[PDB]
């Protein structure tokens, strides 16, 4: 045991060069150790520009990757969990990378550590995406009852949706997505996009196919004619409205 560093350092980089998982662990632990040692040298401001430029680096990474490597994506989202400068990464790119790479636990953990310690509600909507993708409708319904839903009709539809009364939930979502005489303020864009998406879920859950197909195309650019072409524009449309469109028209056909 009276051996030196090189017999530990060179085979470590030699095996981390070949296998990507141990490369992920090594890059994460070395990065976190260096940033932990930055407590002594950089003090108040040069530290803060260092971590701001690291956040710049990582946001550029997650926006411009196109192959989605799981060790790389999870490694740069795993070093964002420990240091509170990089918790504010981007809730859009995190959810896109975790849906594309099949790593929703890592995005869920990062967004949770962000909601610990607007960019409040943005992370809630992009956390409901990751929880919807892996089943988990109980936790997603727990999100919409507390932090996203403001109005009362949202909670009264969440109850009737939870007790499997999907007609008396879609009726309230239709009754909320046409209200103009809102007395106490307006819904947000998040609170209205939830009502649209959950009305689609209720119409799919019942069986109502002549209503599901119309509601699944009458929010893209189609006012008087149904112009199906616009689903390739605005890529969120082909992730949110496309399967309901095709399933509804197919069950009709």
């Amino acid at each position: 045991i009276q051996i030196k560093h090189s017999s530990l350092i060179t085979p470590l980089q030699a095996v981390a060069q070949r296998d990507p998982i141990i490369a992920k662990q090594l890059f994460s632990s070395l990065f976190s150790g260096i940033l932990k040692e930055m407590d002594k040298f950089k003090t108040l401001s040069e530290k803060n520009n260092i971590t701001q430029k690291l956040l710049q680096d990582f946001n550029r990474f997650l926006n411009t990757t196109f192959s989605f490597f799981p060790p790389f994506v999870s490694c740069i989202q795993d070093i964002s969990c420990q240091h509170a400068a990089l918790l504010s990464l981007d809730p859009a790119a995190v959810s896109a990378g975790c849906l594309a790479s099949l790593q929703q636990p890592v995005g869920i953990r990062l967004l949770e550590e962000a909601l610990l310690r607007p960019p409040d509600v943005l992370r809630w909507v992009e956390l409901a995406k990751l929880y919807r993708s892996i089943g988990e409708y109980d936790v997603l319904r727990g999100i919409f009852t507390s932090e996203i839903g403001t109005k009362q009709i949202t909670q009264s539809a969440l109850l009737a949706e939870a007790r499997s009364d999907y007609s008396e939930a879609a009726k309230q979502y239709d009754e909320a997505l046409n209200k103009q005489d809102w007395v106490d303020g307006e819904p947000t864009e998040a609170e209205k996009d939830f009502w649209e998406l959950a009305s689609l879920d209720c119409y799919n859950h019942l069986a109502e196919w002549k209503s599901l197909e119309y509601c699944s195309t009458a929010s893209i650019d189609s006012e008087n004619p149904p112009d199906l072409n616009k689903i390739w524009s605005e890529p969120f449309y082909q992730e949110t409205y496309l399967p309901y469109m095709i399933r509804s028209k197919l069950k009709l056909l």
Side-chain angles (χ1 to χ4, degrees), residues 35-48:
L35 272 295
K36 198 156 301 292
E37 198 74 30
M38 204 183 63
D39 301 341
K40 315 171 59 168
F41 290 169
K42 313 307 209 293
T43 44
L44 296 198
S45 43
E46 55 277 38
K47 160 163 77 178
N48 219 346

Side-chain angles (χ1 to χ4, degrees), residues 7-71:
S7 176
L8 190 46
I9 292 294
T10 42
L12 180 51
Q13 68 174 229
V15 63
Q17 206 170 299
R18 310 186 190 275
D19 174 68
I21 306 300
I22 191 149
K24 158 176 78 185
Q25 290 171 354
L26 189 57
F27 184 54
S28 60
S29 42
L30 281 168
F31 191 94
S32 166
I34 290 158
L35 272 295
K36 198 156 301 292
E37 198 74 30
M38 204 183 63
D39 301 341
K40 315 171 59 168
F41 290 169
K42 313 307 209 293
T43 44
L44 296 198
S45 43
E46 55 277 38
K47 160 163 77 178
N48 219 346
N49 289 15
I50 277 178
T51 61
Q52 176 74 21
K53 199 165 293 297
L54 289 179
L55 165 59
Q56 284 263 40
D57 279 316
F58 287 170
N59 265 331
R60 186 181 48 90
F61 281 178
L62 281 184
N63 293 316
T64 194
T65 174
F66 51 88
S67 182
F68 281 99
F69 203 43

Side-chain angles (χ1 to χ4, degrees), residues 77 93 96 107-108 124 135 150 155 165 174 189 194 197 214 225-226 229:
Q77 278 172 357
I108 275 154
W124 282 120
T150 289
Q155 279 73 240
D165 209 3
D174 183 29
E189 189 174 1
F194 163 63
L197 193 147
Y214 164 59
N229 297 350

Side-chain angles (χ1 to χ4, degrees), residues 89-233:
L89 195 60
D90 208 0
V94 156
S95 88
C98 287
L99 285 171
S101 70
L102 259 289
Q103 299 283 279
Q104 292 93 13
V106 193
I108 275 154
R109 188 72 211 279
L110 173 66
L111 286 180
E112 274 193 10
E113 300 307 316
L115 270 307
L116 299 184
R117 70 164 163 78
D120 193 7
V121 190
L122 200 64
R123 301 177 170 101
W124 282 120
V125 180
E126 305 288 325
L127 189 49
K129 259 158 214 166
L130 296 183
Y131 269 148
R132 182 192 316 277
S133 90
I134 55 175
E136 294 262 33
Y137 283 88
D138 287 1
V139 183
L140 173 137
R141 283 203 279 259
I143 279 174
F144 289 131
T145 52
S146 312
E147 309 99 341
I148 282 178
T150 289
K151 309 297 184 270
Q152 317 92 14
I153 199 74
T154 315
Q155 279 73 240
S156 70
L158 259 281
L159 303 199
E161 184 171 68
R163 62 163 52 88
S164 294
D165 209 3
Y166 300 114
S167 198
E168 291 89 311
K171 213 184 306 178
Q172 292 174 4
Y173 287 142
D174 183 29
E175 202 261 359
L177 290 179
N178 52 6
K179 204 153 171 184
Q180 282 289 326
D181 48 300
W182 277 105
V183 175
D184 304 324
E186 290 316 303
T188 66
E189 189 174 1
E191 203 177 1
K192 176 183 278 299
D193 287 18
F194 163 63
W195 299 343
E196 169 79 35
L197 193 147
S199 183
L200 282 197
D201 265 330
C202 296
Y203 282 138
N204 172 42
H205 263 287
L206 284 157
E208 294 275 355
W209 304 126
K210 286 192 284 257
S211 157
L212 178 60
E213 59 92 17
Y214 164 59
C215 194
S216 177
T217 79
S219 199
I220 39 171
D221 218 323
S222 289
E223 311 99 11
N224 314 324
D227 289 330
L228 301 87
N229 297 350
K230 277 84 175 178
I231 306 174
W232 314 112
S233 66

